[PDB]
Amino acid sequence: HHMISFYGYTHFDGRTLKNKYGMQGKALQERCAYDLLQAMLNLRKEPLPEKFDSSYLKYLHQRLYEKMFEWAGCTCDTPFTFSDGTVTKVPINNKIKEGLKRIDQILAEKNNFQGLSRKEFIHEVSTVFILLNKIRPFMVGNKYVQRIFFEQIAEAAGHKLDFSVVTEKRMQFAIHAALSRGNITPMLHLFEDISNPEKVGILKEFMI
Amino acid sequence: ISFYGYTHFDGRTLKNKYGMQGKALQERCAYDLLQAMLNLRKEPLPEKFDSSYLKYLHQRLYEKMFEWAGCTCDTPFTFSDGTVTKVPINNKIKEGLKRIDQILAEKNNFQGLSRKEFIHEVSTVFILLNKIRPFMVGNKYVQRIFFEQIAEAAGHKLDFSVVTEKRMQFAIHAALGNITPMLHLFEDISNPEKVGILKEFMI
Amino acid sequence: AHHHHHHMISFYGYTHFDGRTLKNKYGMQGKALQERCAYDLLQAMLNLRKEPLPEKFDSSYLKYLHQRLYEKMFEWAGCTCDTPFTFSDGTVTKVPINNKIKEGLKRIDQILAEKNNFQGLSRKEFIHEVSTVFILLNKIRPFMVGNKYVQRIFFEQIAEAAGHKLDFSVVTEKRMQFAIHAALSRGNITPMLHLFEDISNPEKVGILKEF
């Protein structure tokens, strides 16, 4: 809210994102959601990649917001220049670049988490998932691109993740647990329920 | 709803056939409404979709609850106790419904159309049917069933279950005119693949 | 019957000195407690489905469900609150005055025995039988914590054995709350009958999901 305004991603008003539509208010939210839904549809049409890295993450962020924002596949660790000459600011000590480099070597060394048991898969993904949340590569749209990212990683690893049955409060606490101490246990519990089809089915019977 | 004399002197309780009030009324109304929707599906589709069929849908849904089942609010209704309702000035309901009947007749119930053409045709009538409020209560349910059956007869399918109350409210406000949000709505709705994606984000 | 969190659970000595945290075997509090409880509860429900349905449904089986769900969570797993419970720290619980739990469970057992676990009944007869026992099982609160979940599984298994099916997923929290309050205040069981009638009807359940 104030973060997006501080680093010069909004207009002089202080809350309206600089967009390609030139829209504001509810009209902007509607137009953004429509293109975002279309982008997700085309992404599923595309086959899964052979290697998952930070570059692919930026590609996902690009495909999702290229019709809305000029800084689509760009991370906020570096100042962006709009087409009107205006520039953005960078959060001090962000550690985004060093963070993404770490994620890339892990996904390379562990062979994209392929050829693993689901129990082994959960323990490996949970660490990377938390790290990708500690650093916020993109200014806007982190939640969606991270969700799609790990959903496709899982599918390539023979496992399946269903994020539809996790509440916002559960995810917030799991992240808060190992970023405010170092308790990955709630996150482990999250992915274990999520990667378990029988448990997902039961959760759907209580999703009300 | 209170201003047009559809409730009791208390100010919040709709005049009903049950003589019930409060939470008990909401429960009883919903129960018969659910039964009514089931019975409506039991019945076959009509040959022609017009305002008369719209009133018929409204009748079947609320005939066990309200005495003004198949009645529009463009004309004063007389309850069985002598009390009368009021009519919104310059409602334009009668002329509005007459226009809808002519459109659905000339365009052959939106049949034999492409999906793109179907969206642009339904959205126009849907907005018009929202600009005017034919019934005092129960517009949302009768309009949904109305256009769902129109769509099914036109070879296309609409899933209104994945629309939030806020999105529909904005879509109506936009063209009341910007019809683009309404077009975006119906385009997502008539797209089975998009409906599935929307279901994956219903927290 | 308490309000805005339970002073009742605190008064009968089921919570810690803070006044809102249930005495648990993990020694956790707050959101951490909620997470572990939900996780263990989900695991327990999964294991309950693996085992086959019982031959007879009684109050003992009800306690069994409550045990399996909360045995990793609470020391008083399969225990009803009609009898004082002693924690492993020497502390004892109190018993709600005029609870009527013992007579209530005894009646339910007699009903389920005479009516053959509601098997061999018409759908209409099944509704009137389940609704009565459900209300009675709600009028008395056998367990201090966890009544909603154990009752749901209880009647879901009873129904499945009776050839009928109950889908509680299409019931809002407000509808159930009104239905219970209706036949507890010469009681109006009509909202309860309407609830179970919609629930045991696959066609109505399908429509409810679309609305």
Numbering used by the authors:
A (entry chain B): 11 to 190, 197 to 224
B (entry chain C): 14 to 189, 198 to 224
C (entry chain A): 6 to 190, 197 to 222
Give sentences copied directly from the paper behind this entry.
Among these, Bartonella effector proteins (Beps) comprise a particularly diverse ensemble of FIC domains that subvert various host cellular functions. The FIC fold comprises eight conserved α-helices and encompasses a characteristic active site loop between helices α4 and α5 that forms most of the catalytic center and the substrate binding pocket. Additionally, FIC domains generally contain a β-hairpin between helix α2 and helix α3 that is referred to as the “flap” and mediates docking of a target segment in extended conformation via β-strand augmentation.
Members of the Bep5 sub-clade are characterized by the absence of the flap.
